[PDB]
């Protein structure tokens, strides 16, 4: 829930999900999964590619 | 046969057109609502078998459309040639029309019903190498006399068995033949009797033909010699497998495998009695033991007759905290021979994971899929 | 119903242990093997893994098989939740290796006496995945999970044993019958006056059953009325909370929950659309998971039982949504117990009371807590 | 993680019975969400014997003293 809204607000200050990052990836990753599952985006070129929000 | 990537269309709850690229471990992420064990009912579709078939296709959320054509595809790497075919990228593809029509095709031309089947009758992509949800312990739970054919198809016997099956056919209808014709040659002033030349002619040739049928027909049925030694070969291969691979999830355990009687066509037993417990059953193991000794139980099965790709819904889901941790260590152990497709909500399996496609749900009732490396 | 402690000797994994139930959430946390599952079938085997003596601890090195075991439950009856007027309730349970008992208040009792005195902690208990058995139940079969939450089962229960009764009522009245038949012609010395000697008294005595009887059926019908309407009443109160829990589980979701025919029996149907058409079949092993569990925490909404356990209720649901079933159980502390049995420490966070079992000694399963 | 404290722990509580021979007291291993997990370790070690913990009483103090 924190670290699932820690990085909502800094959303608003586009860039990569790596640009959001400092080992804890993964449970960042996990969170733009559920914002995403309330409407709140993802930018992909393909397969493991640039993600950009 | 390395897997490449998965493209789905009008499947379920994929609606728009999206994929995955696999590596040689990809732990499947996404939060509930989304198609992770979705993804595996579509790896069990491309190769074979919601209520009916309708419920396959894209039933549609009433925020977008409602699709009528459903398609899978899977993209694999034979260069070693493991499946009878001289391809070196190959292509399976199974489509569902509303229409109530399914397709199959490979490359370029329409492939029939039962045939992708004998394509992978060899490998055994096997459907149980597909651990499913809910499904981890099916095998503890299951009757002796319904866990003895997972090692049949384990050790690779199936193909054998459908060829004394239809083997055992021929020779029934050769036999009522021979049977039908004996009674015919058993049926059987002067002038010119020349039909007998040709009644004699149409037995010693013909039952010679139908009996020369006989003992060529019960040969290939004795080919089940090697169908049975192959299968039992493999059969103890997994026994001294459990107990290293229990005793290393249990430290200390001791399990065992064993069948009952000799007469394939018989039924296996599991034992397992954990390190300074024992004297019990198994209807008596602890709600996350079941789960660990079916994890070994299908976990050493993949030290015989190990497969390119596997299938884990939620496998660690009833577990410890830790036990999850040496599920995981394993995972990346095993990890080298074959592709592992596991699906975990717990961070333990995925900081061990390369590379993770984590399913959003955007749009609705739409699944989307996101891929991140280590 | 104050849950206060729970000894246990010789319960399956049990070693002689003491569980004293705090107020608010206890997590029972510890890795597998444990036992902490026992911990509800022995909160079965108190109330009302085997098949009999399969309850007994039997086998494990460092130790012996028992003969005899038995289980406390000490409930503080201050308020008087039950029929006595005890303030420290104390009831306990055992059987013998020889398969031979209940004690209530440190006093022998009778086999339907705990029962009686519940009427109670079914539905209220939810072991290890049990959680979809209301789901995948057939509608036939679900409206069970209300009766006993809209208290309806003691005035049924009754009402069966009356009808019961009436039976045998009829039973005696087919012999009178043909006896009387037999009078009329047996009426038309003075020992005759002896045969008339008994029907005329017999009359009013066949009649005391043709009046009792009476008194009965009309001790059924209007009892149905207590039993018909409180089934309503609840299953309505439980209606205007599906969509509150469910909604407030799924932001933007709306469900609801309604019947099929009158009622007796009337087959209830469940029906859900997170935020999109979901036969529920289709919903994902998280969406299966929060549904049985929004509509728990409605029920708990309408007769909220004060000891409610849970064993593994959300091991199939992502780190997002198992806050949900984290703060719908930080809030019911209050108004009611909560035991849960779960090691996602997502739970376990918000949980007042932590009680980790493990087990050393072999098959012998120790017990500590700190919170 | 959850498995690094396991035996990470393994050293301050082997060498404080090494050293004072006193039992790890868990009121003084606290490191400081962490109390959860913390002793959900300890909380495992007791079934591969290698730690073992008294308890006069529920909710009193506990101490880890491994050996077996
Ligand atoms: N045939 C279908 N048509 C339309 N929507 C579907 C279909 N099958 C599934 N869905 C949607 O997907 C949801 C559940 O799909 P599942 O595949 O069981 O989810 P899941 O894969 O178990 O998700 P997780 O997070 O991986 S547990 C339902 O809410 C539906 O909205
Ligand atoms: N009746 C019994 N007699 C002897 N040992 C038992 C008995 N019941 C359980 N055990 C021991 O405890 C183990 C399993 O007990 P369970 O109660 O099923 O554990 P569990 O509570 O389900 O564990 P978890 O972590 O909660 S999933 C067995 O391997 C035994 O060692
Ligand atoms: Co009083
Ligand atoms: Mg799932
Ligand atoms: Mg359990």
Redesign the pocket.
């Known amino acids: 829930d924190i670290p699932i809204e820690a990085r909502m607000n800094e959303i608003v200050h586009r860039i990569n999900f790596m640009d959001l990052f400092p080992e804890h990836l993964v449970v960042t990753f996990l969170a733009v999964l559920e914002l995403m599952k309330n409407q709140l985006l993802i930018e992909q070129e393909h397969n493991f590619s640039d993600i950009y929000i | 046969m390395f897997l490449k990537r998965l493209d789905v269309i009008g ?3 994929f609606a728009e057109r999206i994929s995955v690229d696999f590596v040689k471990v990809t732990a ?1 992420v ?10 595996t ?1 579509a790896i069990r579709w491309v190769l074979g078998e ?1 209520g009916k078939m309708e ?7 009433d925020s977008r459309k409602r699709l009528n054509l459903a398609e899978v595809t899977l993209t694999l790497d034979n260069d070693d040639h493991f499946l009878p075919i001289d391809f070196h990228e190959v292509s399976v593809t199974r489509r569902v029309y509303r229409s109530g029509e399914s397709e199959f095709l490979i490359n370029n031309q329409p492939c029939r019903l039962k045939d992708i089947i004998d394509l992978f009758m060899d490998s055994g992509k096997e459907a149980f190498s597909i651990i499913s ?1 809910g499904k981890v312990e099916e095998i503890l739970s299951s009757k002796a006399e319904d866990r003895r054919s997972i090692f049949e198809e384990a050790a690779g016997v199936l193909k054998y068995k459908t060829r004394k099956k239809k083997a055992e056919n021929k020779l029934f209808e050769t036999q009522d033949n021979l049977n039908r014709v004996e009674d015919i040659l058993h049926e059987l002033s002067i002038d010119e009797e020349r039909v007998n030349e040709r009644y004699k002619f149409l037995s010693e040739q013909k039952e010679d033909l139908t009996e020369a049928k006989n003992t060529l027909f019960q040969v290939i049925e004795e080919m089940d010699e090697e169908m049975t030694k192959r299968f039992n070969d493999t059969f103890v291969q997994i026994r001294s497998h459990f107990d290293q691979v229990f005793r290393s999830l249990f430290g200390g355990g001791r399990a065992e495998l064993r069948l009952t009687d000799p007469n394939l066509l018989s039924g296996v037993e599991i034992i397992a009695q954990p390190p300074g417990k024992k004297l019990q059953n198994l209807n008596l193991l602890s709600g996350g033991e079941r789960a660990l000794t079916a994890i070994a139980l299908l976990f050493s099965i993949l030290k015989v007759r190990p497969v390119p790709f596997c299938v884990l ?2 496998v660690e889901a009833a577990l410890d905290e830790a036990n999850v941790f040496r599920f995981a260590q394993y995972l990346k152990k095993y990890s080298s021979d074959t592709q592992f497709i596991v ?1 975990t ?1 717990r961070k333990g399996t995925m900081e061990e994971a390369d590379v993770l496609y984590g ?1 959003t ?1 955007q749009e609705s ?1 739409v ?1 989307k899929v996101i891929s991140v490396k280590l």
């Open positions: 499947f379920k709850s499947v996404g939060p509930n609502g989304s198609g992770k064990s979705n993804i009912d919601g419920d396959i296709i894209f039933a549609g959320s949800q819904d939620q699906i909500h399913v749900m009732g699944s």
